Write a protein that binds this DNA or RNA. Sequence first.
RNA 1: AAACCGGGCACUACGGUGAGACGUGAAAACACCCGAUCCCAUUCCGACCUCGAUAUGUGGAAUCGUCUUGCGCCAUAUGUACUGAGAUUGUUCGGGAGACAUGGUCCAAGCCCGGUGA
RNA 2: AGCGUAUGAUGUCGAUGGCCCGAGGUAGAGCACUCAAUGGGCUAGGGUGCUUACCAACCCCAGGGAAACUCCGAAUACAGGCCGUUCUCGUUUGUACAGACAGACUUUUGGGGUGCUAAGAUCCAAAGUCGAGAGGGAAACAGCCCAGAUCGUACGCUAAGGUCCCUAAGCAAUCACUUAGUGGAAAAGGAAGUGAUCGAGCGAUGACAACCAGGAGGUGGGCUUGGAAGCAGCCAUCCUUUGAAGAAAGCGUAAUAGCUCACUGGUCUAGCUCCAUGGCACCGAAAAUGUAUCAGGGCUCAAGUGAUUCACCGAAGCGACGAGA
RNA 3: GUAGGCUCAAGCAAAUCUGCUCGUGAGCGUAAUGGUAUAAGCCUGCCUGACUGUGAGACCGACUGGUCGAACAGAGACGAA
Lengths: 113, 50, 103, 216, 148
Amino acid sequence: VIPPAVRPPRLFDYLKPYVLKMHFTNKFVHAQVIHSPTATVACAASSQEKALRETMGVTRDVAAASKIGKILGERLLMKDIPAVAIHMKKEQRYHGKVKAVIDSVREAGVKLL
Amino acid sequence: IVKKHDSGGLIWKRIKLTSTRKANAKTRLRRVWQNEAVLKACGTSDASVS
Amino acid sequence: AGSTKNGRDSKPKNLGVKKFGGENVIPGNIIVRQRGTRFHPGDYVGIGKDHTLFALKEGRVRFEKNKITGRKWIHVDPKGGHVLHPIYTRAAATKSTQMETAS
Amino acid sequence: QLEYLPGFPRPDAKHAETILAVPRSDSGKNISAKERKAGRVPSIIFEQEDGQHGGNKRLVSVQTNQIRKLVTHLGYSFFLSRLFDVEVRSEIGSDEVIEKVRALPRSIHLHSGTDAPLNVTFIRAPPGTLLKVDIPLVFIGDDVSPGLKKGASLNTIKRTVKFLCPAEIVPPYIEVDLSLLDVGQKLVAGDLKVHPALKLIRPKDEPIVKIAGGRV
Amino acid sequence: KKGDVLYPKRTKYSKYRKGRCSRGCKPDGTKLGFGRYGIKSCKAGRLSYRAIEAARRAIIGHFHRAMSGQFRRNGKIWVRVFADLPITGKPTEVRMGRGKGNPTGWIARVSTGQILFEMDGVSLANARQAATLAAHKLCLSTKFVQWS
RNA sequence: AAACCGGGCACUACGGUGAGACGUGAAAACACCCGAUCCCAUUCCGACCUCGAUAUGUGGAAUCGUCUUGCGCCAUAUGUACUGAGAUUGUUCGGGAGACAUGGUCCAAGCCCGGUGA
RNA sequence: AGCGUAUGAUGUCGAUGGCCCGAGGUAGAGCACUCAAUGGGCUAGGGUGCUUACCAACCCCAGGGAAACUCCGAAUACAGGCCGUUCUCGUUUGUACAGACAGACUUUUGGGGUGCUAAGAUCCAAAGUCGAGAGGGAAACAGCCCAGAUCGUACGCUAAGGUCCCUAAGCAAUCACUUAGUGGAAAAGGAAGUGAUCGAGCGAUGACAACCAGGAGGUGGGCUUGGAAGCAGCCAUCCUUUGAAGAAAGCGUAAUAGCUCACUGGUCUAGCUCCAUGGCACCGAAAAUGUAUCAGGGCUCAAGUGAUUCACCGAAGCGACGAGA
RNA sequence: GUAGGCUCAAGCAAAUCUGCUCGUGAGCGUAAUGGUAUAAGCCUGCCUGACUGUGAGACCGACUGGUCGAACAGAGACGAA
Ligand SMILES: [K+]
Ligand SMILES: [K+]
Ligand SMILES: [Mg+2]
Ligand SMILES: [Mg+2]
Ligand SMILES: [Mg+2]
Ligand SMILES: [Mg+2]
Ligand SMILES: [Mg+2]
Ligand SMILES: [Mg+2]
Ligand SMILES: [Mg+2]
Ligand SMILES: [Mg+2]
Ligand SMILES: [Mg+2]
Ligand SMILES: [Mg+2]
Ligand SMILES: [Mg+2]
Ligand SMILES: [Mg+2]
Ligand SMILES: [Mg+2]
Ligand SMILES: [Mg+2]
Ligand SMILES: [Mg+2]
Ligand SMILES: [Mg+2]
Ligand SMILES: [Mg+2]
Ligand SMILES: [Mg+2]
Ligand SMILES: [Mg+2]
Ligand SMILES: [Mg+2]
Ligand SMILES: [Mg+2]
Ligand SMILES: [Mg+2]
Ligand SMILES: [Mg+2]
Ligand SMILES: [Mg+2]
Ligand SMILES: [Mg+2]
Ligand SMILES: [Mg+2]
Ligand SMILES: [Mg+2]
Ligand SMILES: [Mg+2]
Ligand SMILES: [Mg+2]
Ligand SMILES: [Mg+2]
Ligand SMILES: [Mg+2]
Ligand SMILES: [Mg+2]
Ligand SMILES: [Mg+2]
Ligand SMILES: [Mg+2]
């Protein structure tokens, strides 16, 4: 079948302008928080960064995803962003690296919307 | 106008298109053509001081 | 003797659009009464169990059409604009006021 | 090398008339009916280049008698596959030449019941312009063919073939020789003898004509 | 098909609207699709399938008689008009309303300019004579068409 | 630093979706090549997905570019169909398709991370 | 419920138009789905005697019908916001009093269904008139055209419709057409009168019509066949000499014979024949008390038809003067 | 009801799987129409919100009456959320 175009969820009562999106490659893990009204990155954490690619041994596994999630949660609380909304792609489930990033963000003290 | 002339028992006679009827139609056409010319000339802009 | 076996029809249902594009709505106003999703719900539009579309916020009806598939959505553009989630107004907006009054 | 090759048909000198046109101030059914009541066919002269924004279009009217005579004498398909000189004057018999152009008649609308001309369309074709033209086919050699001497019948599948043509060497027709055709086998569009600068638009495996088996 | 008389083998519905037939043309003009000669209509109207088959039989018989030997069978006809609309009727001594009547025949709706027959494999004179012979079976005004 | 390159998000049918041909793996990136111990995948199966593992192999599959095109899509005729008002039993004034036909597949363009330039 | 009245109380309306803006799936069109359906190209295959004028699925090309099909798709209409015009409350609502719930006809059968594309039929949509509306026109006339009667006048201007008489006002003006009383009932089809325009073909190289002379040879083509010889039928339909002549277009013969035509030369001399678009005429055209299908006279020496033009007549419409509420 | 997972029908190649075309033509108990693809279809686990009392605001409309519904209180089901 022809795949339908993916739409953001429809607004019901409130805006919720901060959206968390995750990306994983063969070498690095990524996590971007997007400000939807301006299409700008409010906060981002990845193991490809110059300050982070040497402070951890493995930059591609589940442990790296957990570390990047904790770093992103601390950075989000530093920018006074109390809560984010989770966006999963077509192939992403609540398992493995996605689960590690989500659990580390929630454990850092950021509410999930 | 009634256009039923060859059916039924109620006679609606066919009004012949005479030259006098054509003259009246031409007069009505001249009136509507002058009205249309006035509307074309005046339709380019609106009057001010509203 | 002749007899027709066709004499039935059903009562009218009065389906269709009640609020066209640009019309003002208040919460609870029915926008479309339909069978199935002839129009899909958009932002600030609810959908009922008989696929009735109703406004969730005060605002104006706006129609959207997908150019590729032909699917149509109906949105309400809210009168006072978007309202942030209360967790952002309690914390992020107070820090926003602090950042504004420090500037 | 932009000349008709030897041994190929050229446009005839007898039908090389100049089409006379006068300008037309508007478009629509109203002015078209008023022009046809005055004995003129509404028309348009345009070009390929800016198809959006009109084609540098000029609205004209041509005489009904000249168009009817040309379509009757040439034929419908032969009229649409032959270049013409179009002269635009300020009025009929004047001297203020507004445009003198060599144009192809792109389309002509004849009335479905009375076959009176309702619209003629001319596209500007200066040298070096490539036009999609439907060239009619002339079938010769049917009195010499072995297939039709035996009593079989001719299935003429196509009467026109579409070609992309430079404007200089648009053939008025393509002669199809049937003389080496006995019963059963067929000619395709690749078998047509054309100038090398003409390109088939449809695939070469399109059957043109076929001698089908006569009933024993 | 069904040999001579042409109507559908089946229809989705048995009883149709009357419809309107006095209007309708071909807005782009008409050209022959299969043959070199043809018959087109000049008016808009209704033709019964029996009249269409009578005209076809007249063309076929004229080609069968005027040509002999090997060119007798070389004349080919195309029938471009098809009676696919059923008509109904009611018997005598029957009052006006107890439902629609039983189907009684088939008609074809014809527009102005619509091509009715096409001919190939014959001479121009025989095509003209077959067109004249076929026109007398039809209740609509027709015209002889030549490919050009 | 200001441009360029890679990836992620965003924009979007002139920007979509196919086909063919030619290239490209920058000291970097993406993917594949390899495995199935734990998580996960299989109503059988590392086929898919997942978790692992790659001083440098490959761009065969995908992913990037360039052209050629097919459908679409956008723009635009001319004429006709149809139609609103009006009865010279529609001699007028307006609207105007579908199918044709002609061109185009633009221009502009945001944020973050990494690399080269530095 | 909708629609009438009276009397209160509220809105700033109601009505109508402009601009902006919104969803459409009808008319039309088209085949991309469904149904209905035409011709061809390829070949599976079936079946015949390697072969198979026999049919041949699936694809491909051409083609293109539908109220209960839609790749498309109007004009109108409708909803909403704002702003003009009307200065009228005709709007909403309280209270009190109703009547009415049998409708008719006309708008191309060009909004449709049913009926027979019948009905002064019947049933819905959208207008109008009658109902409940007089006046002028349509001979006479509920429903068509024009137009809304408070009253008076022996004043004026107009609408529809008229201007030879009947009958108020033109034997009106200019340019064309018809000679059928067409106008002033009736189709397919026939005939080709009379104009307008554009073609086509032939033509002093002599065309058309007319008169004169030839119209041949292989050949009696082969078959068929009692005979078929140009001419019952089948197949061939070539060639030659020619100025020209068909293996013959008519007739005619049992078959031959014979007489013409196509074709050609001579004489004569100026244009001749058919194609297209549309103009106006002719035939097709028979009912019953009495002409009886311009109302009648009569009209072509238009008072008929097409186009252009000027005056006038014409209503209870509108004005003037006088009078009411 | 919910959470998770999955994607039909038809055609073609190999000749039931595996793939490629294609697009709503499958399914959704039951007529027809409209709708529908990370579903409204199919499979699995647990459940019983197939609750109690209400309801801003609308859609139908002679009236009787019918329909959709954000949201509130209580008691729950499923879900990492
Ligand atoms: K379940
Ligand atoms: K609750
Ligand atoms: Mg009577
Ligand atoms: Mg009467
Ligand atoms: Mg006169
Ligand atoms: Mg007058
Ligand atoms: Mg226009
Ligand atoms: Mg168009
Ligand atoms: Mg239609
Ligand atoms: Mg059609
Ligand atoms: Mg339809
Ligand atoms: Mg409005
Ligand atoms: Mg009653
Ligand atoms: Mg009643
Ligand atoms: Mg009634
Ligand atoms: Mg009507
Ligand atoms: Mg009716
Ligand atoms: Mg009737
Ligand atoms: Mg009646
Ligand atoms: Mg009655
Ligand atoms: Mg009414
Ligand atoms: Mg009464
Ligand atoms: Mg009244
Ligand atoms: Mg009256
Ligand atoms: Mg009277
Ligand atoms: Mg009267
Ligand atoms: Mg009054
Ligand atoms: Mg008098
Ligand atoms: Mg008469
Ligand atoms: Mg007559
Ligand atoms: Mg008598
Ligand atoms: Mg006067
Ligand atoms: Mg008076
Ligand atoms: Mg008065
Ligand atoms: Mg007074
Ligand atoms: Mg799910």
